[PDB]
Amino acid sequence: STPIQQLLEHFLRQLQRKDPHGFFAFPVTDAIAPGYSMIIKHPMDFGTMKDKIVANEYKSVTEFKADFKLMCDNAMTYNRPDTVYYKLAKKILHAGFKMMS
Amino acid sequence: STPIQQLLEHFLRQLQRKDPHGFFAFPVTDAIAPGYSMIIKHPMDFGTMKDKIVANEYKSVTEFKADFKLMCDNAMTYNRPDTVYYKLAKKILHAGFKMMS
């Protein structure tokens, strides 16, 4: 468990706390989101981010932040702007980047 | 059954032939289309239009045309641009109007 790992795990726990319904916890499936896999080319979610921490796949905060941003951009791309989903993704994108700075 | 009725029934049959899957045949429900009723404030579909023909609620081709437009605009509003539904609604809106000229 390297120092980068405990840094990224703290950031991850604080970002997950901003999504209390767990909308971002797991991979979206086409069954709950028709046509998702044909619109979103590179899916990301907090459960996948946690795995990549433990796989030592992030070597820097910048790489971690890039996956967080991809998760939020995917949500704002797929979901219409008036939805719970879109609003939450915008809200946490900007707050999350502010927190990690 | 008045003369405006056989005119509008002809136009309706010709517009329905442009929708061979029946995507526009019946009212959309929130069960097949999450959030629909909160986003689309005045739903319309070919079944409703046919009923309105029979109720003599159309006194002019222009009123008929307005309900057709409303049907197409609702679909272009609710559905994302990449979907079968949005493309079909755009295609038939402009061709239907050309046809009824």
């Binding site: 046509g35 998702y36 | 959309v28 289309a33 609710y78 559905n79 979907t83």
Partner: peptide, 6 residues
């Protein structure tokens, strides 16, 4: 809950 039609 999520998405459009299909």
């Amino acid at each position: 809950g999520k998405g459009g039609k299909g």
